[PDB]
Design a protein around this ligand. Structure first.
Ligand SMILES: [Mg+2]
Ligand SMILES: [Mg+2]
Ligand SMILES: [Mg+2]
Ligand SMILES: [Mg+2]
Ligand SMILES: [Mg+2]
Ligand SMILES: [Mg+2]
Ligand SMILES: [Mg+2]
Ligand SMILES: [Mg+2]
Ligand SMILES: [Mg+2]
Ligand SMILES: [Mg+2]
Ligand SMILES: [Mg+2]
Ligand SMILES: [Mg+2]
Ligand SMILES: [Mg+2]
Ligand SMILES: [Mg+2]
Ligand SMILES: [Mg+2]
Ligand SMILES: [Mg+2]
Ligand SMILES: [Mg+2]
Ligand SMILES: [Mg+2]
Ligand SMILES: [Mg+2]
Ligand SMILES: [Mg+2]
Ligand SMILES: [Mg+2]
Ligand SMILES: [Mg+2]
Ligand SMILES: [Mg+2]
Ligand SMILES: [Mg+2]
Ligand SMILES: [Mg+2]
Ligand SMILES: [Mg+2]
Ligand SMILES: [Mg+2]
Ligand SMILES: [Mg+2]
Ligand SMILES: [Mg+2]
Ligand SMILES: [Mg+2]
Ligand SMILES: [Mg+2]
Ligand SMILES: [Mg+2]
Ligand SMILES: [Mg+2]
Ligand SMILES: [Mg+2]
Ligand SMILES: [Mg+2]
Ligand SMILES: [Mg+2]
Ligand SMILES: [Mg+2]
Ligand SMILES: [Mg+2]
Ligand SMILES: [Mg+2]
Ligand SMILES: [Mg+2]
Ligand SMILES: [Mg+2]
Ligand SMILES: [Mg+2]
Ligand SMILES: [Mg+2]
Ligand SMILES: [Mg+2]
Ligand SMILES: [Mg+2]
Ligand SMILES: [Mg+2]
Ligand SMILES: [Mg+2]
Ligand SMILES: [Mg+2]
Ligand SMILES: [Mg+2]
Ligand SMILES: [Mg+2]
Ligand SMILES: [Mg+2]
Ligand SMILES: [Mg+2]
Ligand SMILES: [Mg+2]
Ligand SMILES: [Mg+2]
Ligand SMILES: [Mg+2]
Ligand SMILES: [Mg+2]
Ligand SMILES: [Mg+2]
Ligand SMILES: [Mg+2]
Ligand SMILES: [Mg+2]
Ligand SMILES: [Mg+2]
Ligand SMILES: [Mg+2]
Ligand SMILES: [Mg+2]
Ligand SMILES: [Mg+2]
Ligand SMILES: [Mg+2]
Ligand SMILES: [Mg+2]
Ligand SMILES: [Mg+2]
Ligand SMILES: [Mg+2]
Ligand SMILES: [Mg+2]
Ligand SMILES: [Mg+2]
Ligand SMILES: [Mg+2]
Ligand SMILES: [Mg+2]
Ligand SMILES: [Mg+2]
Ligand SMILES: [Mg+2]
Ligand SMILES: [Mg+2]
Ligand SMILES: [Mg+2]
Ligand SMILES: [Mg+2]
Ligand SMILES: [Mg+2]
Ligand SMILES: [Mg+2]
Ligand SMILES: [Mg+2]
Ligand SMILES: [Mg+2]
Ligand SMILES: [Mg+2]
Ligand SMILES: [Mg+2]
Ligand SMILES: [Mg+2]
Ligand SMILES: [Mg+2]
Ligand SMILES: [Mg+2]
Ligand SMILES: [Mg+2]
Ligand SMILES: [Mg+2]
Ligand SMILES: [Mg+2]
Ligand SMILES: [Mg+2]
Ligand SMILES: [Mg+2]
Ligand SMILES: [Mg+2]
Ligand SMILES: [Mg+2]
Ligand SMILES: [Mg+2]
Ligand SMILES: [Mg+2]
Ligand SMILES: [Mg+2]
Ligand SMILES: [Mg+2]
Ligand SMILES: [Mg+2]
Ligand SMILES: [Mg+2]
Ligand SMILES: [Mg+2]
Ligand SMILES: [Mg+2]
Ligand SMILES: [Mg+2]
Ligand SMILES: [Mg+2]
Ligand SMILES: [Mg+2]
Ligand SMILES: [Mg+2]
Ligand SMILES: [Mg+2]
Ligand SMILES: [Mg+2]
Ligand SMILES: [Mg+2]
Ligand SMILES: [Mg+2]
Ligand SMILES: [Mg+2]
Lengths: 147, 210
RNA sequence: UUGGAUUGUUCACCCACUAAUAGGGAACGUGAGCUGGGUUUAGACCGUCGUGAGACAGGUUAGUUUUACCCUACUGAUGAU
RNA sequence: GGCCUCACGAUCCUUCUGACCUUUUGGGUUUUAAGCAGGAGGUGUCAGAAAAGUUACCACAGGGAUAACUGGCUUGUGGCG
RNA sequence: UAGCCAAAUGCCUCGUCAUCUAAUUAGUGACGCGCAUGAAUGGAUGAACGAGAUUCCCACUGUCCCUACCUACUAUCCAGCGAAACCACAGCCAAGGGAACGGGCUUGGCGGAAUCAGCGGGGAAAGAAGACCCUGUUGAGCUUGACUCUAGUCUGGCACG
RNA sequence: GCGCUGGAGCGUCGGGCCCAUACCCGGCCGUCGCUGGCAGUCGGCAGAGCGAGAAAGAGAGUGGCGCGGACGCUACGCCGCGACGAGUAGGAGGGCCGCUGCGGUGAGCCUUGAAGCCUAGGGCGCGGGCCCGGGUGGAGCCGCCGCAGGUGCAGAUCUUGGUGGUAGUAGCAAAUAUUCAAACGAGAACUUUGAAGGCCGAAGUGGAGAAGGGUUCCAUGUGAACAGCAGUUGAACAUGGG
RNA sequence: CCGGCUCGCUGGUGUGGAGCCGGGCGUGGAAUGCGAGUGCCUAGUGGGCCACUUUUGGUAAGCAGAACUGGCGCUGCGGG
RNA sequence: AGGGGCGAAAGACUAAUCGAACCAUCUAGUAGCUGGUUCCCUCCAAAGUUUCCCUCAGGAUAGCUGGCGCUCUCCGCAGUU
RNA sequence: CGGCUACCCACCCGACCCGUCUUGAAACACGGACCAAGGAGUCUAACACGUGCGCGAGUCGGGGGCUACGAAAGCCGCCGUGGCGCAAUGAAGGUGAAGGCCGGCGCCGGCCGAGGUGGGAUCCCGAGGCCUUCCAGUCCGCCGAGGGCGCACCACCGGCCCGUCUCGCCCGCCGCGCCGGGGAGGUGGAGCACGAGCGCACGUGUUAGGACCCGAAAGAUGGUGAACUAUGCC
RNA sequence: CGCGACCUCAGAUCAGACGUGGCGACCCGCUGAAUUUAAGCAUAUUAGUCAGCGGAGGAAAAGAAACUAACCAGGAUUCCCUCAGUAACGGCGAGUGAACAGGGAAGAGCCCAGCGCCGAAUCCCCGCCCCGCGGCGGGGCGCGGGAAAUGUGGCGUACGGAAGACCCACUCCCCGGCGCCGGGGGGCCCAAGUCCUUCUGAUCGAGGCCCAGCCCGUGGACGGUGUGAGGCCGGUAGCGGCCCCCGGCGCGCCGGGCCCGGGUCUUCCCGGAGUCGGGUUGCUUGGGAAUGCAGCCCAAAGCGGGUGGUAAACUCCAUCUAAGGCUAAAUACCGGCACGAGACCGAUAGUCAACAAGUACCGUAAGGGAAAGUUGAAAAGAACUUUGAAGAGAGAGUUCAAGAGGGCGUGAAACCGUUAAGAGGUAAACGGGUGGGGUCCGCGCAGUCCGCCCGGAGGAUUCAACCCGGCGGCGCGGUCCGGCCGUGCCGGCGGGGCGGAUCUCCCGCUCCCGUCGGCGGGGGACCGCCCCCCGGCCGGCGACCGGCCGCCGCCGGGCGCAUUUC
């Protein structure tokens, strides 16, 4: 609110908090990003490196659906399915392993980052990382690819 | 004159934006107007569903949404002819029809036909003349029990198939997913060039042996 | 500590008288005291420079000089303690 | 690279060179084009605008930060002792 | 080249000579290697004329020596009616210092109500956000061998053909 | 500056004295620091302390009458010690400083007198400002807790409006000039009449048109306002004509 | 300081060097003074001037241009 | 009839406006340049300096400043010797 | 009789008129006769930082729908679609974030398992001691030599991920190929290395908007004027 | 030569109709800058924006793919969120900047040309008769006229259609004339104090209205009434009442219009040309070897053409069918009509305008453009007397009030006069310190009391201690009895709700000859959490207690009797 702003305590001071030698003029340094190459060179090089110039190829008609591929990690892999699935699989004596369809959850690619608990799984995903697959194989499990 | 550190901004306010600005001060009034028109429509079609006709099961085109099922525009002609429903009577009984839909699959076509059969089973058709019932009209005792239904008729829900836990086989444990993915990528990329190399080799070896 | 010829002249030179015709300051004293002769608006013409518009501490010509009744100062004039 | 202290140049664009390099977008092949890296073409106002004059017919915002008038400090010069 | 000149054109220059005066940077007539004259960017001349710019002479006169007086209307006073510019507060000087020329500050000189008629020394008096000079990455009139273009114009192709 | 010459001058000096917001002590205000102390008001359900140079318990267990005791403590509160206090541009914090409206709240105020305004009245607060007393007023007004802003003026050759000095001043000085008697009238240098003296001097200060103005033309009444004095007059005002 | 490992670097030489562990020594190894360290956001500023001493141009300047320090600016007060 | 008219030509006249008329709109045109910038108290407290810029009346960037804190104590630091 | 304060007068000392620009202002620098009223950093959006609240690897109904003040308020959850965050790197094809030990023939089974060092607030243990006559003596506390597990955080050494360079030897097959994968050592990255974000509100700073208020010389668009004057004609 | 047709073009005050212009907030088509930014400026930016022109509607436009995509595919147009400040464009500088998919609001599809098939089976106008006519229509009679074969109407349009044959198969569709039934536009109305005192000028102010705590309340919004009123009045609430006009429905007859449909098989047909496209030029766009549009030139094809975001060639695919047209809905609104509201403004504010305001007034014109509200409850607007000609005073009177006297509520400051006080030759004025004089204030002028004790004069229904009743507190009672809760737990031959990505008899759906092999739903079991019931422990009742007993305190009523108490 304007009650608590600084302008309420600036009344009585001639310059209104803007200086007496250099008055608060309209646009002493140009409009917007003016003179980035000329008189704002130091600021645009000390704080915006790479700002000037092009790089890379140009993709004219880019559609995000083609490149849409959310990823999940093995630490969160068990979080997708309910707790009772994991506890029953751990208690299970016949060696049956739960099947985790990460696609139904909404992740296409599985990346292996965290520690995977010692428990057989069947991860049914769309893509797999090399380390993710070898962790699943090492802990004991299967990887199923779906389209 | 930018400050010490911060973003570079390019606001789109250089035009005369104040001259063309839309304010939502009529948002609650428009909500009430929509609500009153919706209720007036609902009471106008006394026994017909408020949401209107029935729309088919449809899954979204793009890769991002091919795992989800949404509502369709209308039932395809091929689906209707399989179900034995005429294209001119379907709209009269309250079935959405659009002739532009194709059918490149089979399970989706069967699902729509099954839904159409269920809709005809659930539908209660009043006689055209109340005094004189006809062959296609519903019974008198079930006529009195007809009423509207709120929301869409037979809403489309994303049915999920769950499979029970199984024992992992040795072939599954020996399957190399990452190797299979990379090898498939390489084969797709280099399919044509290998073919032209084989053709060139054959067409050059034949000259050597001729 | 002058009268004059010449020049807008400050300077300068000459004629005559005299006693001497000494030098300077006061916002280069003094434009709400004057004049506008010259610089220095806008019009013009000559010469030089520039393709040109134009320039010329080179020359020539015509070219609006506003106001005091206010305070003080000074000149006088009533009066006042 | 020159015994050392100097002898030289960003963005974008163009040109050349290099990979059995990537993309050319619904798939395959080949020209072409676009990419990555390393050089060259350039800015001498040299941290890099693409740039001829006049205005006395001039205009605007300002500046005693900045001249020509007067006024101050020194007196080179001028005058005087 | 013919012509012409210290010209309305000559810096040096107030050129040199003669005349015009007692005295002339003025005027006129001459002389010319003329900073930088000159032939239709016209030269030279020339009767008449010019509210054009110059020098001299006769007459004339207050322009002056050297000021004086008279008239009409103001100014002056009264009756009636009656504004405006301008105004930080205001208003006596000398020196000192100071933002380098004070009315106020310091030291002195001193100062005495309300006032009338003149006057132009000062108020760095009043009008106008200096027109001169400079700055501005502020312009406008104009010019061109400045940059970029454009009407129009000439030419070629295509269609009418 | 006055003035000063057995200095009130000059050079070397001795005592004494003079005073700054400086220094020492003291009072008050505020800031900072000790990130100090206080829930211990533990009372006939009791025993009154943890200032003292020295790290830790006025600690517990096994054997040899009278019915009494001040304040405190809105802990965003209170209290104790020290040091410090300048300030442009600028920054931050506290405002029980100020204005307008909104949600709550004061069994708020008020025709037995609100806001506003004036006041040589009583005060408070450093200060922003505020509360009472006296006079006019006749219909609304305020305190606290939160919210919101078109929220505080000495200037900007500021905008609008009003009023001073100038000042009863400048001026009412272009075109020769008025005088006498009477009338109306309350009032006459200015109207009317009569007489005299004048001017325009037939390219006029005369008589009539066009453009332009539009009732200014005529009669009566008024003298409120205007005709830069005044008016008994008007091209002024009001009535009716043309 | 004392032991013990590691090394693909360098080597006559368990040579050199570096790294990593274990063990021991408190008279806290000049004086004086002082609680320190660290991270974000940020206004205003970006025309200066003067003075002792050093010093450049100019004869000189209340001139112009430098270095240290202190002031004015931003600052009142006693004295001149 | 306005970048047009007209000019025996002075940039003259074009409704008191002419080296480009008047009215309305774009338009509250832009300004690195002047002027102003409104209540109290307390606390802290500067710079006119480096570098770069068609930069010199300005900015960006360091430096100076304030605010907010945070990590520790009852070893460290110093315009000093 | 008292009343400092508020009215007037007298005296002593001090005392130049304010604002603004400036290194320097009382200035012979500009604005200012006086008074009353109005009057100038506001609002929208974006970002950053700091602070308050809710939830928390989730968070947010802002759009839509269901039920005087109320155009409010509540609810949706199979309306979380979607934004932000939870994963970065590369131009892209793409890839995408610990390992060590034991036995057998690079591969198989089992074990340990998600860094180290220095400084690190706090916590844990305790060589003894805190007395009422003196001795042994227990329980509740308190202090303490010394020794530890060390928050957050800082510094260094390691490790892992993506691009790139070099030296390389192996591994896999549905299509043994100009196939795919793996190591060590340097290097570039806005990375990981046991979350910290999302929504709302407040303050500050910057920006684009008229943008603290007033101010041009100019430019463009559309219309009105030859009743003055310039010129031609009747 | 003439007569009679057709074709092109005229003249009609010919009969019957239509367009013209205006508003223009929103919308459609065209034209279209410079301010500004880029710290200059030329490309860009401002910006398909202002200005200018044309055309409507209640909405307009658009609109049912020559579409989006490359996926397991969606499926008209339009609008919100999101995509996204992204792809992309840009002196790659300043800056500009979409689209797909997804979630919603809404959702509605269709019709010609062409190819064909039916005796032009079609349509318009005039004359007459009947019916209703203030949306000129329906039926019938005209060897009445005309349009049209240079193509009207029926079938029929990319989703196939038509015709023939074979099977199945329905009649109630549709108007409009007349006529009987149960949602709006206005009119007239509906509850309760002027109750008793009391101020006032007037009350709507203040007190009371019982043991019907005045009356009404589905009505305590507002306004007016001599203040500030739920009850005085209008209205207010009401699924409250009465009257008139009209409306969408649900019936009846009446006239005619059509006697129409689906599946299988056989045969034929199927498309819009100066148009696409290519070259070039110009504008636009994010569209970048050219997104869109336009001018010129070339200018087609039909297993063809378009699109598939990098130009081209070859080759398989995916998706539509351009050059014809219609269509409500969701959407925009600063013009207009009638309304409601506001954390807005309160007469220098707010629209320029609260009032005889786009009026007065100025300019030739285009245009510019104000200042200006408040008597009083009621004019009760000051009778009458007096001086003056009058303006205007002095009395008197109205009003509570003229201290409200016709621009009249309140009435500041600058400014001016008068009265009173003080001072005055260094312009005025100011800060510190006093002194003097005035103004009022201290209702001051014999000066505070408050507790305990002593002493003297007194007056009470009087203290302590006991009795009864009531109330409260207290861990009383180490462990009284009974209830309640746990953001505590345990047991359960208990009765349930929620969730689960934990498993597993019945029904519906599709392929095969009642069966073997599949999907969806329901049911059952299991687990987690929660609700209730029973039993057993822990804690609390100091966010959450009841009955006894014990102690204490307090209050009332007695006995208390004056060496106590007040
Ligand atoms: Mg300040
Ligand atoms: Mg200033
Ligand atoms: Mg500045
Ligand atoms: Mg600014
Ligand atoms: Mg540059
Ligand atoms: Mg800044
Ligand atoms: Mg819907
Ligand atoms: Mg003379
Ligand atoms: Mg002079
Ligand atoms: Mg003069
Ligand atoms: Mg003079
Ligand atoms: Mg002259
Ligand atoms: Mg001239
Ligand atoms: Mg006079
Ligand atoms: Mg560039
Ligand atoms: Mg391509
Ligand atoms: Mg000239
Ligand atoms: Mg001089
Ligand atoms: Mg000399
Ligand atoms: Mg002479
Ligand atoms: Mg001569
Ligand atoms: Mg010549
Ligand atoms: Mg010549
Ligand atoms: Mg007089
Ligand atoms: Mg004085
Ligand atoms: Mg003078
Ligand atoms: Mg000027
Ligand atoms: Mg100026
Ligand atoms: Mg510059
Ligand atoms: Mg220009
Ligand atoms: Mg050129
Ligand atoms: Mg201070
Ligand atoms: Mg307000
Ligand atoms: Mg007063
Ligand atoms: Mg009243
Ligand atoms: Mg003022
Ligand atoms: Mg006079
Ligand atoms: Mg006259
Ligand atoms: Mg006449
Ligand atoms: Mg007359
Ligand atoms: Mg008069
Ligand atoms: Mg600031
Ligand atoms: Mg500056
Ligand atoms: Mg500087
Ligand atoms: Mg100097
Ligand atoms: Mg300064
Ligand atoms: Mg200082
Ligand atoms: Mg000082
Ligand atoms: Mg001295
Ligand atoms: Mg023309
Ligand atoms: Mg000229
Ligand atoms: Mg112009
Ligand atoms: Mg402005
Ligand atoms: Mg300080
Ligand atoms: Mg500048
Ligand atoms: Mg004094
Ligand atoms: Mg100033
Ligand atoms: Mg300045
Ligand atoms: Mg100066
Ligand atoms: Mg000053
Ligand atoms: Mg001076
Ligand atoms: Mg001046
Ligand atoms: Mg100035
Ligand atoms: Mg002035
Ligand atoms: Mg004010
Ligand atoms: Mg924060
Ligand atoms: Mg985003
Ligand atoms: Mg910032
Ligand atoms: Mg702003
Ligand atoms: Mg302006
Ligand atoms: Mg321009
Ligand atoms: Mg004329
Ligand atoms: Mg006719
Ligand atoms: Mg029209
Ligand atoms: Mg610019
Ligand atoms: Mg600019
Ligand atoms: Mg420019
Ligand atoms: Mg463009
Ligand atoms: Mg454009
Ligand atoms: Mg366009
Ligand atoms: Mg327009
Ligand atoms: Mg339409
Ligand atoms: Mg179609
Ligand atoms: Mg779409
Ligand atoms: Mg654009
Ligand atoms: Mg979409
Ligand atoms: Mg036909
Ligand atoms: Mg009322
Ligand atoms: Mg009552
Ligand atoms: Mg009422
Ligand atoms: Mg009542
Ligand atoms: Mg009533
Ligand atoms: Mg265009
Ligand atoms: Mg292809
Ligand atoms: Mg079509
Ligand atoms: Mg079409
Ligand atoms: Mg249409
Ligand atoms: Mg409302
Ligand atoms: Mg008014
Ligand atoms: Mg008022
Ligand atoms: Mg107004
Ligand atoms: Mg007024
Ligand atoms: Mg009034
Ligand atoms: Mg008023
Ligand atoms: Mg009264
Ligand atoms: Mg009154
Ligand atoms: Mg009243
Ligand atoms: Mg009044
Ligand atoms: Mg007196």
């Amino acid at each position: 609110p304007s009650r608590l702003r600084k302008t309420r305590k600036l009344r009585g001071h001639v310059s209104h908090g803007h200086g007496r030698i250099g008055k608060h003029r309209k646009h002493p340094g140009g409009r917007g990003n003016a003179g980035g190459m000329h008189h704002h060179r130091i600021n645009f090089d000390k704080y915006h490196p790479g700002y000037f110039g092009k790089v890379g190829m140009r993709h004219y008609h880019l559609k995000r659906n083609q490149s849409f591929c959310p990823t999940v990690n093995l630490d969160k892999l068990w979080t997708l399915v309910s707790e009772q699935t994991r506890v029953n699989a751990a208690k299970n004596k016949t060696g049956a392993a739960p099947i985790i369809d990460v696609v139904r959850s909404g992740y296409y690619k599985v990346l292996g980052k965290g520690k995977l608990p010692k428990q057989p799984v069947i991860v049914k995903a769309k893509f797999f990382s090399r380390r993710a697959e070898e962790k699943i194989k090492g802990v004991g499990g299967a990887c199923v690819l779906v389209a | 004159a930018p400050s010490r550190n911060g973003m570079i901004l390019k606001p789109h306010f250089h035009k005369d934006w104040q001259r063309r600005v839309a304010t939502w001060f009529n948002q609650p009034a428009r909500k009430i107007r929509r609500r009153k028109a919706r209720q007036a429509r609902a009471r106008r079609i006394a026994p017909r569903p408020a949401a209107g006709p029935i729309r088919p099961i449809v899954r979204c085109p793009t890769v991002r949404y091919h795992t989800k099922v949404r509502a369709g525009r209308g039932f395809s002609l091929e689906e209707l002819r399989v179900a034995g429903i005429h294209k001119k009577v379907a709209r009269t009984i309250g079935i959405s029809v659009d002739p532009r839909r194709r059918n490149k699959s089979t399970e989706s076509l069967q699902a729509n036909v099954q839904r159409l059969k269920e809709y005809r089973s659930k539908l209660v058709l009043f006689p055209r003349k109340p005094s004189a019932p006809k062959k296609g009209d519903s019974s008198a005792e079930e006529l009195k029990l007809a009423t509207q239904l709120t929301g869409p008729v037979m809403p489309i829900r994303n049915v999920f198939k769950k499979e029970k836990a199984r024992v992992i086989t040795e072939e599954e444990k020996n399957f190399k997913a990452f190797a299979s993915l990379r090898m498939a990528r390489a084969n797709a990329r280099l399919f044509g060039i290998r073919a032209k190399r084989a053709k060139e080799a054959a067409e050059q070896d034949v000259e050597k042996k001729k």
